[PDB]
Specification:
The structure is a homohexamer of 73-residue chains.
Chain A: E1 2-5, E2 8-9, E3 12-17, E4 20-25, E5 32-37, E6 40-41, E7 45-52, E8 55-57, E9 64-72
PDB class: protein fibril
Keywords: Amyloid, tau, protein fibril
Assembly: hexameric
Chain lengths: 73, 73, 73, 73, 73, 73
């Protein structure tokens, strides 16, 4: 058995942007109110209240090349 | 058995943008109010209240090349 | 048995845009009010209230090339 | 007198090739025989016999840009 | 007199080759036989016999830009 | 008299090659025979016999940029 795994890649992932800007993200501008009375919990409680995990991602490129080469005998 | 795996890739994923901008994201501009009385929970509780996990993604490119080469003998 | 896997790719995925902008996203502008009284839960509770997981995605390109090359003997 | 020589060149000379090969050049494969008897030469003699100056030129690109910018006052 | 010589060059000369190869050059494979009897030369002789000055030229690119800027007052 | 020689060069001469190889040059594989009898020479003789000056040039690039900037007052 003779196996010759010789893939050739000369590819490009490219971006050109003259200017990038004037980006506004205002998550949670409104008031948050949580009133709790006489509540009962028998197991684990996870609670998130307010402004959490919000993202502003503005990469000049942000380009991705994902590649996988699997040879199984 | 003779196997010759020789794929050739000269591809391009390209983007050109003169200007990118004036982007506004206002998730949760309205008030959030949560009133709870005498409630009972016998098992696990996950609670998210307000403005969470909101995303503003403005990549100058944001281009993607995904590639997979599997050889199984 | 002789196998010659030799695909040739010279393809392009291209985008050109003069200007990209003046994008407005206002999810959850209206008031959210949640009243709960004497409720009973025998099993797990997941609760999301307000403005969650909203996305504003404005890539200058956003082009995708997805490729797969499987050889099974 | 005002002279403004401001030409803008953004040109491209591009070549893309998946594979280049299996090129065979066999000049002068046949027998060469030169029999000369009692010849007389009163002036200069230049002589080439056999297989001379043969060329195999296989550039992966071989692209050419020739440019000239002349201003005379 | 005002002379402004402000040319802008943003050019490219580009080659992309996946593979280059299997190139064969066999100049002068045939027998060469020169037989000379009683020849008379009264001036200069230049003689080349056999397999001379043959070229195999296989550049991965081989691309050229030739450029010339001249101002004469 | 005002002369402003301000040319701008941002050019590129580029080559990309996945693989370069399997190049064979066999100049003068055939037998060479030169038989001479009673020849007469009154001036200079230059003689080359066999396999001379053959070239195998295989540069990974081999790209050239030739440029000239002449200003004469």
């Amino acid at each position: 058995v003779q196996i010759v795994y010789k893939p050739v890649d000369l590819s490009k992932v490219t971006s050109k942007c003259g200017s990038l800007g004037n980006i506004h993200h205002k998550p949670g501008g409104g008031q948050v109110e949580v009133k709790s009375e006489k509540l009962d919990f028998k197991d684990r409680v996870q609670s998130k209240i307010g402004s959490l995990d919000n993202i502003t991602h503005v990469p000049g490129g942000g380009n991705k090349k994902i590649e996988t080469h699997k040879l199984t005998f």
